[PDB]
């Protein structure tokens, strides 16, 4: 029988809210290798012949995502359920709850990574966004963090 600390996944965000979260994340897809390379080539050509606002992108790497967490810099955290090493993500929801940061779980690590170029991403987070982020956070809260606040129970 699964312990109460396990099975927190599998029970994940609903269809509509998950789709909305995916759509919101698609608005800040990080520049891919080809796009970054072509942009750098264009910049070099412009400078070689004849100073920009800070960029924004989704956070995906586990190490730096956790680094942003604990510092309270993570506005939202999205976690995959089918990750093979469960211990990598067992403590992440607990850390997010302790730090007071919204968090959510999704089914399919590959689908999580498809919005961040990489084949798989395990977890994802956002640092900056326009205004639908607050509504999405409220929906995620009311649908998973407060409705299923009894995750500590059952087996």
């Amino acid at each position: 029988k699964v312990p109460p600390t396990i099975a927190q996944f599998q029970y994940t965000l609903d269809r509509n809210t998950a789709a909305e979260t995916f759509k919101l994340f698609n608005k800040y897809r990080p520049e891919t290798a080809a796009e970054k390379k072509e942009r750098l080539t264009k910049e070099a050509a412009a400078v070689a012949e004849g100073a920009s606002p800070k960029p924004y992108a989704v956070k995906y790497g586990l190490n730096h995502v956790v680094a942003l967490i604990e510092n309270k810099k993570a506005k939202l955290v999205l976690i995959a359920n089918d990750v093979d090493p469960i211990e990598l993500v067992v403590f992440l929801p607990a850390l997010c709850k302790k730090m007071g940061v919204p968090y959510a779980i999704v089914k399919g690590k590959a689908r999580l990574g498809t919005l961040v170029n990489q084949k798989t991403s395990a977890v994802a987070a956002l640092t900056e966004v326009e205004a639908a982020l607050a509504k999405l956070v409220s929906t995620i809260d009311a649908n998973f963090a407060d409705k299923y606040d009894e995750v500590k129970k059952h087996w």
């Binding site: 396990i6 190490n63 956790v66 680094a67 211990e87 990598l88 067992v90």
Partner: protein
């Protein structure tokens, strides 16, 4: 980093979560062959602190050894025998059973150009390190040899 938390989580092995994980993984390991390739290390923190890296050329193996010679050294030798072209740099525990013990072993390919082209691991390609586990030069082998620090006929011409 996640490793800072993963190490502490793995420290409390008797905890419910790790107890469930071990009993879940024991059946999967048993269903596998005696020696089989592992796509990724089940204990990434341990492997990473053991000098293993995810770059190309690194291979993780797993092997089952009967319980009841040092088990770690026997497992290393067994994996090296099948993996003739690989070098058994180190191995570590992952799971134990009543009748069998499971130890994960990380292998480094010396023939791969990636391993030879970096100065941090090119030393392993030298012929001196061939069959390192056979001579017990690994961490388990050195410990078994008793290479501790401290207390723990000749005739000249005149």
């Amino acid at each position: 980093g996640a490793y800072k938390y993963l190490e502490e989580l793995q420290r409390k092995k008797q905890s419910d979560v790790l107890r469930f994980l071990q009993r879940v993984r024991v059946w999967e390991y048993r269903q596998k062959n005696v020696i089989h390739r592992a796509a990724r290390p089940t204990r990434p923190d341990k492997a990473r602190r053991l000098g293993y890296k995810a770059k190309q050329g690194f291979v993780i193996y797993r092997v089952r050894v009967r319980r009841g010679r040092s088990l770690r050294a026997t497992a290393e030798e067994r994996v090296g025998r099948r993996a003739a072209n690989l070098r058994v740099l180190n191995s570590y525990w992952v799971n134990q059973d009543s009748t069998y013990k499971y130890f994960e072993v990380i292998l480094v390919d010396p023939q791969h150009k990636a391993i030879r082209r970096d100065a941090r691991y090119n030393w392993i390609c030298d012929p001196v390190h061939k069959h390192r586990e056979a001579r017990g030069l690994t961490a388990t082998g050195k410990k078994s040899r008793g290479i501790n620090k401290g207390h723990k006929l000749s005739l000249w011409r005149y």
